[PDB]
Design a protein around this ligand. Structure first.
Ligand SMILES: *[C@@H]1O[C@H](CO)[C@@H](O[C@@H]2O[C@H](CO)[C@@H](O[C@@H]3O[C@H](CO)[C@@H](O)[C@H](O)[C@@H]3O)[C@H](O)[C@H]2NC(C)=O)[C@H](O)[C@H]1NC(C)=O
Ligand SMILES: *[C@@H]1O[C@H](CO)[C@@H](O[C@@H]2O[C@H](CO)[C@@H](O)[C@H](O)[C@H]2NC(C)=O)[C@H](O)[C@H]1NC(C)=O
Lengths: 437, 156, 49, 49, 49
C-alpha cells in the first residue's frame, strides 16, 4: 500500500503517521529522526599554512662582482650589495678593502608542520542530507541510515521507505568556505594568485602534498649593517597567524537553526529546517485484519486536564464499548495535538487514558482509535514554568478552534454587532422601498 | 583541560540570567536556535551575571569546555486564557505581543466601522422617512412615526 | 497520578457545628487507584482530609 | 516554584494550602501553628524590692 | 543563593547550626585515579568583598 506523509525535520519529535487501509485495522507508524547530517560538496581550491622564511648563508665574496639569476622559487628575492666589509670573530673576512660584494638570497616555503596545521579553502554547492531514522510499528523497531532525497529506499520489516527531498533547499554553508582543524568559517577567501600579503592567503598551494607554491609576503630584504655579516630581511608576518587571531566568529557559533558543524567529513548536523516527505510502501503482512482486531463502538472523548506545556502536558480519557481485549492504533488527525502513545490497550472496561501535547488554548482534534472516530475539544491553561531543558513536543500551532472560549466570544460579539448591522440594512431597505412608491 | 564550574541559572520570562564564576578566563558563547542566530561570544575573566534571551525556538549556551546546554522557553504568560475578554487579551499579549495588538486594533476598528455604518444607516432612515413630513405645510407627523422615530418637535 | 473525570458533588449532611459537621460524597470515574489532593477553593468550608 | 498564601494565626487550625503547578498533580500542603510566641524587646529601666 | 552573599549562613559566631548551598555537585572520578572531583560555586564572601 502506497502512502505518503510529511514529517517535521526536527530531531526527537515522534511523528505518528496514520495508515488507514480500508478493510484492515489502522496502523500507526511512529518514526523519528535520531540524527541528520547535511554534507556539502567540496572543491578544495587551496590551502594556507604557516610559512618558513628560509634565507641561506650570504655569499660575501672577496673583491669580485657576483650577480645571481632569479630562479623560479616562491617569492625569491636575490640582491647584490657593494662595499660590504664582513667582520667575523677573529677578524676581517677578506683583506681586500672596499671591493667585497655581498650576495643575499631569500625565499619562502611551506612550514614543516604544513601537513598537520593548515586551513583549507573550499567552494560548496548542493547538499546531500543523510539521516538516521528510527522507525517503529507493530513489533519492528529499527534505526536505518537514509540519504534523504528521492533516491534511497530502505526496507524495514518488509516495508519500503523513500525519504523525499527536503522542502527547503537552505544550507548553512555559503558559497565560499574555509576549514580549520575543527571549526568552519564562511568568508570570501582570495582566489589563487591574488593573495595580498599579511591577510589570509599570503601563502597558497593546491594540495597538502603539491609542490607548487605562490606567496607574496613582501621579502624586501635590505642592506647589511656595516661591519657585520648577516642577511637583514623584512617581511609581513604569516597571514595564517593573523587569521588565527582574528578569525571572526566561527560558523560553529553562528549556524542558524541550531545545528552543530563537525569537521572531518565536513557537515552540519541536526539542522531543524523544513519537512521530510516520506513515501512508504507496506506489505499486507504488516497489517492486521479487521476480523482479528477489536471493534470499538460509541467512542466519546473527554479531556481530563489540559496544560499546553512542551512535555506531554494534556491527558484525555476515551470511553468506549469493545468486544475483545486487544491493542490498536490511536492517533490525532490534526497537528494541534500529538499523542505520546501510538498503540493503546483496550480492555473490556470502557476506559483508556492517553497523553497529548498541544500548544493551543483550545485544542480541538478528532482522535481515532481502532477504526472509530471521536472528537475532543479541550480548554488548556498555560504553564507556569518558564525555561525547560527539552525541545517542544508539539507542532507550534496556536489558532484556537471555533467554540473555544476565546474565539467563541469573538463569534458572539461579531454575530450580535452584525445582527444589529443587518437589522439596520433591513430597516433602511424597508423605508426606502416604502418611499420608492 | 579543566571544566569550568556549571553556572547557576535563574529562569525568567523569555530570558535566563546566568551567574558565571570562572577561576581563569573562559569562553561564553550563546546562540539562539532560529532563523536569525542572535549569537554572541565573549571572554569572561571575572565573576559576572549575564542575561541571555531564550526565544521559543531555543537557546544554546557554551561555557568553557562543558558540553553545550540547550534551554527552550515554554509558552508562559500572564492572564487567564478563558475568562472575560480582558484576560484573553492579556494572555495573547504575553504570548505573541505586537501581533495581538494588531489583532485587537483591527477587530476594534472593524467593530467601530460596523457600528458607525449601522448608525449612519439608521439616521439616514430617520431622514428618508421624516423629511417628506417636514417639507409639507401641515406638520402632521402622526404619533406612530412620532414615537417610533424621534420626532422633530414641529412648531405650530 | 489518577485522572478524574465527570465529577459530581452531592452533600450528604450539613450541620455547621464547630467540628467537622458536614459530610459530602464525591462521585467520579477514575482510571487507576491512587491518592490525590482534595481542597475547597473557598474558605466557606474547610475539609478535614 | 514560588507560591504565596495566607493562613490565619490561630493555633490548631489545619490550613490546607493548595498548590497547582500545571503539568503536575496538585499537591495540598497542610500546615498548622502549634504555638506562637510574641517576645517583646526589653530595656530594664529599674528594679524594686 | 549560591555564589552571592550568604553562601554560608550562621546565626552566631559560635553557633553549631549552619546553612549552606554551595552547589557541591561531586562528579565521577576519572578512570585510573583516586580523587574526589567536586565542582562548586566559589565562596560568596569573596565575591562580596
Ligand atoms: C689577494 O689579495 C690581493 C690584494 O687585494 C687581491 O688583488 C685584487 O685583485 C682584484 C682583481 O680584480 C683587484 O680588483 C680590481 O681592482 C680594480 C682597481 O680598483 C677595479 O677597477 C676592478 O674592477 C677590480 O675590482 C684588486 O684591486 C686587487 N687588490 C688590490 C689591493 O689591488 C687578490 O685578488 C687576492 N687573491 C686571493 C686569491 O684572495
Ligand atoms: C527501540 O529499540 C531501541 C534500542 O535500544 C530503544 O532505545 C533505547 O531504549 C532504552 C530503554 O531504556 C534507553 O535506555 C535508551 O536510551 C534507548 N536508546 C536510544 C538511542 O534512544 C527504544 O526504546 C526502543 N523503542 C521503544 C518504544 O522502547
Amino acid at each position: 500500500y502506497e502512502h505518503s506523509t510529511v514529517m517535521p525535520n526536527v530531531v526527537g519529535f515522534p511523528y505518528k503517521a496514520h495508515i488507514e487501509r480500508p478493510g484492515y485495522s489502522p496502523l500507526t507508524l511512529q518514526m523519528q529522526v535520531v540524527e541528520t547530517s547535511l554534507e556539502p560538496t567540496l572543491n578544495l581550491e587551496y590551502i594556507t599554512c604557516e610559512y618558513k622564511t628560509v634565507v641561506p648563508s650570504p655569499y660575501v665574496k672577496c673583491c669580485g662582482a657576483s650577480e645571481c639569476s632569479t630562479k623560479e622559487k616562491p617569492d625569491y628575492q636575490c640582491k647584490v650589495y657593494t662595499g660590504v666589509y664582513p667582520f667575523m670573530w677573529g677578524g676581517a673576512y677578506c683583506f681586500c678593502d672596499s671591493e667585497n660584494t655581498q650576495l643575499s638570497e631569500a625565499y619562502v616555503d611551506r612550514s614543516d608542520v604544513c601537513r598537520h596545521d593548515h586551513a583549507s579553502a573550499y567552494k560548496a554547492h548542493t547538499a546531500s542530507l543523510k539521516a538516521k531514522v528510527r522507525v517503529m510499528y507493530g513489533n519492528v523497531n529499527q534505526t536505518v541510515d537514509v540519504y534523504v532525497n528521492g533516491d534511497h529506499a530502505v526496507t524495514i520489516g518488509g516495508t519500503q521507505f523513500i525519504f523525499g527531498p527536503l522542502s527547503s533547499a537552505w544550507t548553512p554553508f555559503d558559497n565560499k568556505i574555509v576549514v580549520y582543524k575543527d571549526e568552519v568559517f564562511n568568508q570570501d577567501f582570495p582566489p589563487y594568485g591574488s593573495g595580498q600579503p599579511g591577510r589570509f592567503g599570503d601563502i597558497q598551494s593546491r594540495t597538502v602534498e603539491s609542490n607548487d607554491l605562490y606567496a607574496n609576503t613582501a621579502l624586501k630584504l635590505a642592506r647589511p649593517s656595516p661591519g657585520m655579516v648577516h642577511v637583514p630581511y623584512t617581511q609581513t608576518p604569516s597571514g595564517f597567524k593573523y587569521w588565527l587571531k582574528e578569525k571572526g566568529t566561527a560558523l560553529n557559533t553562528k549556524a542558524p537553526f541550531g545545528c552543530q558543524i563537525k569537521t572531518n567529513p565536513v557537515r552540519a548536523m541536526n539542522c531543524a529546517v523544513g519537512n521530510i516527505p516520506v513515501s512508504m510502501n507496506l506489505p499486507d503482512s504488516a497489517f492486521t485484519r479487521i476480523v482479528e482486531a477489536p471493534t470499538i463502538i460509541d467512542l466519546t472523548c473527554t479531556v481530563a486536564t489540559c496544560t499546553h506545556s512542551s512535555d506531554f502536558g494534556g491527558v484525555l480519557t476515551l470511553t468506549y464499548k469493545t468486544d475483545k481485549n486487544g491493542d490498536c492504533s490511536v492517533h490525532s488527525h490534526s497537528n494541534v495535538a500529538t499523542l505520546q502513545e501510538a498503540t493503546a490497550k483496550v480492555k473490556t472496561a470502557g476506559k483508556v487514558t492517553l497523553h497529548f501535547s498541544t500548544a493551543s488554548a483550545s485544542p480541538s482534534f478528532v482522535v481515532s482509535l481502532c477504526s472509530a472516530r471521536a472528537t475532543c475539544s479541550a480548554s488548556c491553561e498555560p504553564p507556569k514554568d518558564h525555561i525547560v531543558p527539552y525541545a517542544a513536543s508539539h507542532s507550534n500551532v496556536v489558532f484556537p478552534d471555533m467554540s473555544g472560549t476565546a474565539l467563541s466570544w469573538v463569534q458572539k460579539i461579531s454575530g450580535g454587532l452584525g445582527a444589529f448591522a443587518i437589522g439596520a440594512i433591513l430597516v433602511l431597505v424597508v423605508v426606502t422601498c416604502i418611499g420608492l412608491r | 583541560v579543566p571544566m569550568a564550574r556549571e553556572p547557576t541559572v535563574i529562569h525568567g520570562k523569555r530570558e535566563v540570567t546566568l551567574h558565571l564564576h570562572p577561576d581563569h578566563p573562559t569562553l561564553f558563547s550563546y546562540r539562539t536556535l532560529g532563523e536569525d542566530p542572535q549569537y554572541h561570544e565573549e571572554w569572561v575573566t571575572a565573576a559576572v551575571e549575564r542575561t541571555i534571551p531564550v526565544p521559543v525556538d531555543g537557546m544554546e549556551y557554551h561555557w568553557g569546555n562543558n558540553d553545550p546546554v540547550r534551554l527552550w522557553s515554554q509558552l508562559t504568560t500572564e492572564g487567564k486564557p478563558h475568562g472575560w475578554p480582558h484576560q484573553i487579551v492579556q494572555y495573547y499579549y504575553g504570548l505573541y505581543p505586537a501581533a495581538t495588538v494588531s489583532a485587537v486594533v483591527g477587530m476594534s476598528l472593524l467593530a467601530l466601522i460596523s457600528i458607525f455604518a449601522s448608525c449612519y444607516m439608521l439616521v439616514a432612515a430617520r431622514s428618508k422617512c421624516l423629511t417628506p413630513y417636514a417639507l409639507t405645510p401641515g406638520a402632521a407627523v402622526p404619533w406612530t412615526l412620532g414615537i417610533l422615530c424621534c420626532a422633530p418637535r414641529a412648531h405650530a
